[PDB]
């Protein structure tokens, strides 16, 4: 069912946001794992899987609406070399994406694409959850100190 | 079965004590949870449920005795902005309530309301248990330090 | 994630609406139970639990958004001394709250807080369900008469 | 297998009778449910499902016989605004349909379509069952009175 | 709970859209079945059941809001005499209905009926799914040819 | 219980019709099987078993009524050398038999043998089912073509 | 354990090869799915998951060897607009990658990194399996024709 170019553009931009996030979260996961921080690897890994699923949602929506998903343009990945740094990159990225999400959600309403705006609000509720975990983690390093924080990552929780 | 105004007054005052406690414990629970302190959220949450049940006990007793429960007057909640502070508010509150409980228990005996005094001693045995957990927690922060204490709350026990 | 004062104000006002409702529904439940009306106690009790859960939803949202839940101000509880009267208080209260809910939902959209507006519409769909049960009950008293209606409450349904 | 126009006409008229009945029974069901009369909603709902199945039987028979089912013409639905009234509409409708059924059954025999007359007698045995329930219900209102009758509908039987 | 005439009008128009769809999908189902196309009958049959459930949703919403569902006016059913033709009717119909759905969803928001707009977006997400299956089917006939397409329908999938 | 010569004659003629059908359907079944058309063999085989059971029904009825079943006269079997041809023989035969069935059913009524007419209408409902499968098959060859139709028979369905 | 720059370069180039393959296979999967070709979507989807796992293998090896995985550079995705075309892109890509794999395997031996060459030969045995499926598919279109081939994809195998 063909449906509104602008909507398909927002969708493709949002997809791009996802693509950079799966890559950055996956490398971070494996960097943490590598350091022996099992808890951080377990969490960052599943968020990457979440992003992966967010992306498939867009790809399918774009295809229904009769557009062509763009999986060719990749964004800048800001990796970071220490955990406190890595986590902040993750947060900044999440924040930018949420911003794009709000822009896109308002427009779909204007244009009456309520199902595209329904899906996006679902995805935004998720992002805001990634945002909460990162914020909490960053404060914990601040509150218990880095060495206690590091010792607290060597075994994954349950 | 109508039964002694003074008793119904003590019961209503005690109920009020409970009402402020459910509110303060519930906000504290969610403040802890929010900070990522799962263990503190789990405990403070169940104490709120305990208080909630204490209250239903009073409401029913007052109704049997033919009085009208007072759920309109709320007390001062002293929240606190740091855990050590939050826990001390909880303790002080518990202490005040226990004091009222003893006053009320002695009077029911004078007046021969042994079933109201039976129920209250049950509730007091419970309060004294809330009092013990808080005292132990506050000393632990004192003994292992705050950062170790904080690291020790990030996963709930079993 | 800090987010819009006005939204946090609406959220806190809505929470207050909930707090008065849990109290009024719980006292009503126990008044009915006390009279031997098992069916009315069972229903009014679970609605109180629903309101209780609505409240926890707000408390957590306010905390995420970085505001402070207000559990200190309690509203006027209009109890009532006969069932027809009690049920009408419940209805009026529900109606007022729904009104606040619509005001708050429209504003979150303006401000782009779609996740806060998502949660609220969920809670509103629930309120409108409480509103339907009360309306039906009040008409049944009108249609079968009060004594038949009363006889119809002495055993809880399933 | 092409087979007798007149038979296909009777079949289509009978189908029409069914279509109006599914609609009237379904609205009535939901009107009762809405009023809190669970027993009346449960029964009227299943009769609607019975009519629904009667219709599919005709649609398939018409198609075999090589005719075209007519699902375009809808009859007059006589709703009614009170239960005694609603039930009487249901009865009248059933009565009219049974009358058409007998006309159609006699003709299929003349014409030797014994399988069409076999199916119809099955459907008629069913109608006469809908007719019996309605008659019994209407008399019960007459015998115990409307308020007792109404109180007797608020919980579905088993 | 009485609520906005215009909303109840849109709801009734939408219900009408559903009614024509259940009828057209059900006849099509049985026409396919009749031809020996089991796969097409199985799918078209369940979509009819979906529409049937969509309708019950409206009927109940209209009744809550205190309006009267209109099950008297039936729309034009455009049947079709060959499968490619039948499927295109189904698609066109779906498309028209989706259009009405968007009009109605925007208005409920204006008027603040968020629960009616919630339900409708759910129903629209469904329609868009019926729309996707039909589009895919029509292209498959185009891509493998009609005879291969026909041979591919004689046994239902799983 | 001795009962009406004419009825016993119709019964014996009908039995004869069955006997030729079991033979033709069984040879056809095995011819199809032989060619590797599993689906056609499976179906034609079970119809032969159905006819076989129809026959036993007559044999027993004739014996009760005190007549002697005639299993000595066999009819003309029209085999056919290609599937389209084979299926058409089967159809023609079925059609002739149904015709005899209607003649016999009307007469039993005249004569009041309602149990013989009951059994026969059961058997006729079955024949009309054999008639429907053959008609559908013959059209499918017409609609998808013979080679696609043939490829569609090499594995039995379920 | 730090280990040979050249090896880490080959590893990173190979990882890049994987990254483009996951993207192209995933879009193709969803394009096929979209067209209603369930079998092609199921297969192309799992190959994408295989590539995804190949990539994680490299990322971890690079990290052990003390290099930094490069997830920033994405290659040219050659999509294609028809299935025959899409499958050929997939094949060409696979072929190029296998070529790089052989170059890298020979060098690790020279340099004595037998564990890196062990892992790579495992991954190459896999690629050669992706290569075999594509070759077989492309010939099947050639041998049965495209319409028969297309009809053969509408239900996933098992
Ligand atoms: C367009 C890019 C990609 C897309 C859309 C994508 C999509 C997916 C999806 C939807 C799944 C299945 C989700 C589920 O299990 O429910 C999956 C699984 C996974 N992905 Fe990705 N992915 C991509 C890139 C990546 C990257 C860069 C890596 C590896 C470096 C990766 C590693 C994995 C792994 C390891 C799994 C799970 C395997 C399993 O448990 O069976 N993905 N991917
Ligand atoms: C007069 C005030 C209140 C009364 C008497 C009351 C009473 C109760 C009771 C007796 C229960 C059931 C206990 C059990 O599970 O055995 C309950 C459950 C609970 N209450 Fe309250 N409550 C009140 C205020 C609060 C507040 C302020 C909150 C929320 C902010 C709250 C949140 C809950 C929750 C979440 C549960 C458990 C829900 C579940 O697990 O199903 N309550 N309450
Ligand atoms: C206002 C019109 C109608 C309404 C609202 C309606 C509603 C329904 C509903 C809600 C159900 C149950 C859904 C479920 O199983 O979860 C049902 C079942 C069904 N309907 Fe309808 N229906 C209508 C018209 C039709 C027509 C025209 C036909 C028949 C020609 C039909 C045939 C059926 C059948 C066969 C079933 C399923 C029976 C079973 O599996 O027990 N319906 N209908
Ligand atoms: C060319 C003539 C016929 C052939 C080759 C034939 C063949 C068969 C075969 C192979 C079976 C299945 C055997 C099994 O169950 O393993 C069968 C079953 C049977 N036959 Fe015949 N038959 C013929 C004539 C007759 C006649 C004249 C009658 C009836 C008057 C008859 C009555 C039955 C019955 C009742 C069964 C068993 C039904 C069951 O238990 O499901 N057959 N026949
Ligand atoms: Mn995401
Ligand atoms: Mn995220
Ligand atoms: Mn207590
Ligand atoms: Mn306590
Ligand atoms: Mn609420
Ligand atoms: Mn409520
Ligand atoms: Mn009927
Ligand atoms: Mn009926
Ligand atoms: Mn629908
Ligand atoms: Mn639809
Ligand atoms: Mn027979
Ligand atoms: Mn036969
Ligand atoms: Mn690979
Ligand atoms: Mn590969």
UniProtKB/Swiss-Prot annotation, chains A, B, C, D, E, F, G:
InterPro entries: Bacterioferritin (IPR002024), Ferritin-like (IPR012347), Ferritin-like_diiron (IPR009040), Ferritin-like_SF (IPR009078), Ferritin_DPS_dom (IPR008331)
Phenotype when changing residue 88 to Q: In strain: ECOR 30
Catalyzed chemical reaction(s): 4 Fe(2+) + O2 + 4 H(+) = 4 Fe(3+) + 2 H2O; Fe(2+)(in) = Fe(2+)(out)
Effect caused by changing residue 125 to A: In strain: ECOR 30
Binding site residues for Fe cation 2: 51, 94, 127, 130
Keyword Metal-binding carried by entry: yes
Cofactor note as given: Binds 1 heme b (iron(II)-protoporphyrin IX) group per dimer. Binds 2 iron ions per subunit. The catalytic dinuclear iron-binding site within each subunit is known as the ferroxidase center. In BFR, the ferroxidase center appears to function as a true di-iron catalytic cofactor, rather than as a pore for the transfer of iron into the central cavity, as found for eukaryotic ferritins.
All residue ranges annotated as the Ferritin-like diiron domain in the record: 1-145
GO biological process entries: intracellular iron ion homeostasis; iron ion transport
Protein name, as recorded: Bacterioferritin
């Amino acid at each position: 069912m063909k449906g509104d170019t602008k909507v398909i553009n927002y969708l493709n931009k949002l997809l791009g946001n996802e693509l950079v996030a799966i890559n950055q979260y996956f490398l971070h996961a494996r960097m943490f794992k590598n350091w022996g921080l099992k808890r951080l690897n377990d969490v960052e890994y599943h968020e990457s899987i979440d992003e992966m699923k967010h992306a498939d949602r867009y790809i399918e929506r774009i295809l229904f609406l009769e557009g062509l998903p763009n999986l060719q343009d990749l964004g800048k990945l800001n990796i970071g070399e220490d955990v406190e740094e890595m986590l902040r990159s993750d947060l900044a990225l999440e924040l930018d994406g949420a911003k794009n999400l709000r822009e896109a959600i308002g427009y779909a309403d204007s244009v009456h694409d309520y199902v595209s705006r329904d899906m996006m609000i679902e995805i935004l509720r998720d992002e805001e959850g990634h945002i909460d975990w990162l914020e909490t983690e960053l404060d914990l390093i601040q509150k218990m100190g880095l060495q206690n924080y590091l010792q607290a990552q060597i075994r994954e929780e349950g």
